[PDB]
Each structure stands twice: as C-alpha cells, then as structure tokens.
Amino acid sequence: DVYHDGACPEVKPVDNFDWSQYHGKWWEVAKYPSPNGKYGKCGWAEYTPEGKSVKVSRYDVIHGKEYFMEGTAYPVGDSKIGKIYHSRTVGGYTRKTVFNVLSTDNKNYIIGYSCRYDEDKKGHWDHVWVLSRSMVLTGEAKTAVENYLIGSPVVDSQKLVYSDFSEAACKVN
Ligand SMILES: O=C(O)c1ccccc1-c1c2ccc(=O)cc-2oc2cc(O)ccc12
C-alpha cells in the first residue's frame, strides 16, 4: 500500500465477476510496494470454499523468510459485482476491508484494488494487485492487463513491483 493526499478514488468494479472461478492457486505477478521495505518477488494466493465464503490464503517469501496471511472473502452484495469484503480476525481484533475487482476475464487474470483513509492526514492508502493463473502472463491476457493498467486513472503503473519467481527471490533461509 502507498500513501496519497486526498480522498480515495471513485472506482467501478466489474459487473460480470464469476464467483465459481475463485478457486485454486493464483500467482501474484505485480503489486504496489508496502512501507518499511516489507515486500517480496515470490508470492501467490490459494482459494478454498469455507461455507458461503472463500478462504484466501496468501504466501510470500520476503528476504528469505515465509510469511502467511489468511482471511475470508465474501461479496458485499450480488456475487457478480466485484465489490467484496475481506475479513481477518486475530485474537479479539477483526479487520474487515472492502476491495474491488477492477478487471478480470474470469480465467487467466484478476486485477484487484483496495483503498483506506488515513485517519490522521487528509489522505489515503491504496493497493493494487495482479493475480494470474500462470507464472508468466502472455497472449490476450497480457494484452488485456497492460491495456487496463495503462488506461486506468486509478493505477499508478510506475509504482508497480513485478515478480520474477526466480530461484533467488523464492529461496527460504
Ligand atoms: O490479503 C490481504 O491481506 C488483504 C487484506 C485486505 C484487502 C485485500 C487483501 C488482499 C491482498 C492484499 C495484498 C496483496 O498484495 C494481494 C492481495 O490479494 C487479495 C486477493 C483476494 O482475492 C482477496 C484479498 C486480497
């Protein structure tokens, strides 16, 4: 997540999201950076049914160590509109965050986005992520993704960090 002044932007989620396709493993090929240098060029997400929700298990190798973050996702309203809640509870503290699917073809890629207000300054914290069923995007999908990131007024495509899944980035020790 990245800081910017002002209110979160207006965003239009996709309206033909297919919730059935929200399963298995997806590689995180691009994302914004995070503060305190805490990121990452080797990461992925796995999705599993948990009642009406999906359990979102995210794995990352950052500076030689494994990090794990789990949470539950479920639609805010109609499952076709990609406006969704992520929920994570640790001890007595739950955080619930609306995120948006900004672009998808429901099978090779998902581009997601979330925004939160800085309770301090008049500003906000943004995050963009790009998931892909293949480690490397190619073809139509790569075209659809580059077009979207380039056309989109919401995404700052120069702040994106790209993952290589290289031997060096993915090594734990
Ligand atoms: O997984 C999280 O930590 C998270 C928390 C709040 C909002 C979004 C996410 C979340 C992601 C956060 C960072 C990131 O690099 C990738 C994320 O991917 C998600 C994918 C989901 O389907 C559903 C949720 C996420």
| 44: amino acid identity, one letter | W
CA-73 nearest atom, ligand 1: 23
1-173: CATH topology is Lipocalin (2.40.128)
Q: Which two tokens stand for residue 168?
A: 């060096």
**How far is ligand 1, taken at its centre, from the CA of residue 138, in Å?**
23
Given a contact cutoff of 8 angstroms between Cβ atoms, the answer to whether 66 and 58 are in contact is: no
| 169: amino acid identity, one letter | A
Dihedral angle, C-alpha 144, 148, 150, 151, nearest 10 °: 130
SS (H, E, C) the chain: CEEEECCCCCCCCCCCCCHHHCCEEEEEEEECCCHHHCCCCCEEEEEEEECCEEEEEEEEEECCEEEEEEEEEEECCCCCCCEEEEEEEECCEEEEEEEEEEEECCCCEEEEEEEEEECCCCEEEEEEEEEECCCCCCHHHHHHHHHHHHHCCCCCCCCCEECCCCHHHHCCC
CA-32 nearest atom, ligand 1: 15
Given a contact cutoff of 8 angstroms between Cβ atoms, the answer to whether 102 and 110 are in contact is: no
Given a contact cutoff of 8 angstroms between Cβ atoms, the answer to whether 144 and 132 are in contact is: no
Q: Distances from the Cα of 124 to the Cαs of 115, 121, 128, 163, in angstroms?
A: 7, 8, 13, 25
Whose Cα sits closest to atom 3 in ligand 1?
69
Whose Cα sits closest to atom 5 in ligand 1?
86
Structure-solving method: X-ray
Burial 66-91 (b: 16+ CB within 10 A, else e): eeeeebbbebeeeeebbbbebeeeee
Rounded distance between C-alpha atoms, residue 83 and residue 30, angstroms: 20
**How far is ligand 1, taken at its centre, from the CA of residue 140, in Å?**
24
**How far is ligand 1, taken at its centre, from the CA of residue 173, in Å?**
25
Nearest to 47 by CA among 76, 18, 12: 18
Dihedral angle, C-alpha 104, 141, 34, 46, nearest 10 °: 70
Rounded distance between C-alpha atoms, residue 129 and residue 108, angstroms: 14
The data reach a resolution, in angstroms, of 2.0
- Pocket of ligand 1 contains residue 116 by CB under 6 Å: no
**How far is ligand 1, taken at its centre, from the CA of residue 67, in Å?**
13
Task: Show me where the domains of the chain are located.
Answer: 1-173
**How far is ligand 1, taken at its centre, from the CA of residue 6, in Å?**
23
